[model samples]
Target: STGSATTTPIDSLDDAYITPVQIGTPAQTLNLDFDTGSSDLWVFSSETTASEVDGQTIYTPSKSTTAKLLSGATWSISYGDGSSSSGDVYTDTVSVGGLTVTGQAVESAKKVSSSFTEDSTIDGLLGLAFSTLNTVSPTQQKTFFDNAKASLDSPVFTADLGYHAPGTYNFGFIDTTAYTGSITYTAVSTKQGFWEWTSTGYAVGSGTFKSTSIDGIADTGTTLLYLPATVVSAYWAQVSGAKSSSSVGGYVFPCSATLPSFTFGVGSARIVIPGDYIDFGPISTGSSSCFGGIQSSAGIGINIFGDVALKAAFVVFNGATTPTLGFASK
Candidate 1:
């Protein structure tokens, strides 16, 4: 359930979901894991049997009227988490949001794992964040941004996330209507992947983390913002007698008061996380309550700015031009 956020249909594919755009067209939707920590677009193929995988939707070219195979080219993708899927490269006339792009390179998977098998409703993942890691290759290893960068009318890509079900994740040609003019755009220092940023520190309930300051990347691939344990625990402790719920795996506290604002210092820009986003979901059957966002991850991997984080801000990935990261509306 970590990656299970929201679902939307792509084209006529009942279970398909949108990730980032490719070739400036909404076509060629990839089954991305929606990671904020990593940067990549990957998919499971017709070759991946139901037994080898779990819940996420796997793509089958035969089901589509415009699908085609790319001859003499093999495709494979590996992740930092030790998960890998390999298969052949194919071309297709893909479409999303009523827009179509022809001759798109699509990867068909021959292998997958149980971790990816949980979301049968989800096609794959749409990694809209930044990363340094990508599939190494002798031939062109194309990413969503790699293909769409040149074709876009503007040098930007934006992600609009749904809070619950039946909402949308839109891409292809930045919809300026969705953003306020107050947005702050951060220039990319390096072409690492997506676009990474630094956080001066974090604040919770009027408290700061570690006093040591912190830096992180805005990752859509990761589900949660993984923080240093001490920083997470220390910040939550200041929540005017906060309590933890075993059923929910995070902290729960009274929501009556004006929840403190948490800010991520991005040099000249100070990105703030509003109090409402901290109040997770509703309580369940038992006495246990849903989290108020801000949870601990034990510092296992990259510090992620996942759906919870992205949902709080109007985000823009400037892949269409100089590749910058922009944040707006607190």
Candidate 2:
């Protein structure tokens, strides 16, 4: 089976992207963040605190005859951005695009962090990472991707994020017309429960490629690209007015500064992130300071090839035997 779904950005900043999905018997529709960094299909539900609820939609299990309680099973998860959510579990019929997965574990949120409550557009998260990272207790539950893998034409899914337009998340098969060149496949280490891989090196603008290998995870849920301080410094130094400021929380520069593109090596191929993509608007409305889409991962403790880098290429989450990652120019 195959499923093709449209994933659209939430706002102009492209802080996140959401995809519509159906759940339960009568099909309760919700727009969820398809996150590749986490492993739990959680949702804002009827069980959530009233005060915590905003304009977000909720999944009411009582309305769906197919919803069954997974008694004693509970889940709690935290995000890299410091947001968190937790609650009991329910098994229900879930569908993404045209693909269906029966009895999928859906975490019903009883409580959510402030950040989540404020994000009115996000109904929940659909984790695409390995199920081994699932936070459910008593018995681990597989991700929607894992349950549907056997039925898919190919055990793979693709993320095509857009800069100024809507993107797509394709399951079961790759569309030949979606990209411009041959894919460069790389090994993925899921031991730690992430689509983690290593890059050959990076280049600032048109500079020569540095052969220094860097380990990082491809996290669709994260908003920026985080690299080692040495690399981040090198890139920011090229900008005339760029400076790393704790007061601003990251690297910021003049809004009108001439930004340079960033490039990372995938085997012999290089994925180039355009210059305009780095100028992440203003620090505040009508401010002269502008935040960068790239930052130092030193404080975070791990480098992350997040949306910034993923948006520059066609990303493939290969769920075939042994698991691999494929990248191509688009």
Candidate 3:
């Protein structure tokens, strides 16, 4: 099939908004973080122990007339942020926006930690990102896309992430109006869950680093950009008055007036991270004079472009037409 024409950010405004998903059986409704980083659909269940359920949104199966439990299957998913949740398996009809998919794979829990219980405002995650990282098993079940593919107008999934407060994350047919008519495509490398590509080099402050010949991966699963420790440390050095503060997990920098502007590119796309996005939470803080944008992940995968990097561009996971990825408007 001929690839759909790419759309520009302005034209794609409708595509950027969010689409709601019915999480549990009989379906309890909850908004999801439509991510391209990892593949898993998880949420907090009302049956979760009260203590563990603190701060999380517990879905009452009784509330939904159609909800069903998986009976015996269970799950535990952990993120790089050190947060995780474990729950029993369940199956039911899952719905996103106005579309309903039956016999969908769902996970409901009787116990959940702060990761799924507190601080994090969202109740659960709806992994619509890429199938490369999907955790679905033959015995376990089908992905949201795997079942909904036939119902969609097209075979694509597009996420329009918003930053001005909480914004919508939409899924389904790729809105052609959101593209620029021409999209740069990257083939999915064989790695499971990792979208691998290459970068010619990097830039910081007013300096441009020579081609380091590094692999670049775009992920929504991770909150921070994990780079090689050496590269992360080196990039931070360029920011004048940059200092590490423990309150922000040694990754945050103090909000300093002297923080410099930084820009970098991936393939032909260049991204700029303003000082505000890098500063520690923007609330009252102690220690570090300036927060850093790059951080170290010793055992984690190579480089990951987290929410900060993703918010700067219009991204599309074009599974509708072909197994290809496209992006526009950095």
Best by TM-score: 2
Predicted candidate 3: what Cα RMSD to the true structure? 5.5
What is the C-alpha local distance difference test score of each model? 0.54, 0.94, 0.57
Q: Compare the candidates by lDDT and give the number of the best one.
A: 2
Instruction: At residue 28, give the lDDT of candidate 2.
Output: 97
By TM-score, highest first, what's the ranking? 2, 3, 1
Q: Write the per-residue lDDT of candidate 2 for residues 146-228, one digit (tens) a residue.
A: 99999999999999999967899999999889998899998899988999999999999989899989999999999899999
RMSD of 1: 6.4
Off by over 4 Å in 1: 1-40, 53-58, 63-84, 128-132, 136-140, 165-174, 189-194, 206-213, 240-261, 279-292, 296-298
Give the count of colliding residue pairs in each prediction.
28, 0, 28
Q: Against the true structure, candidate 2 has what lDDT?
A: 0.94
Q: What's the CA error at residue 159 for candidate 1, in Å?
A: 1.8
Better of 1 and 3 by TM-score: 3
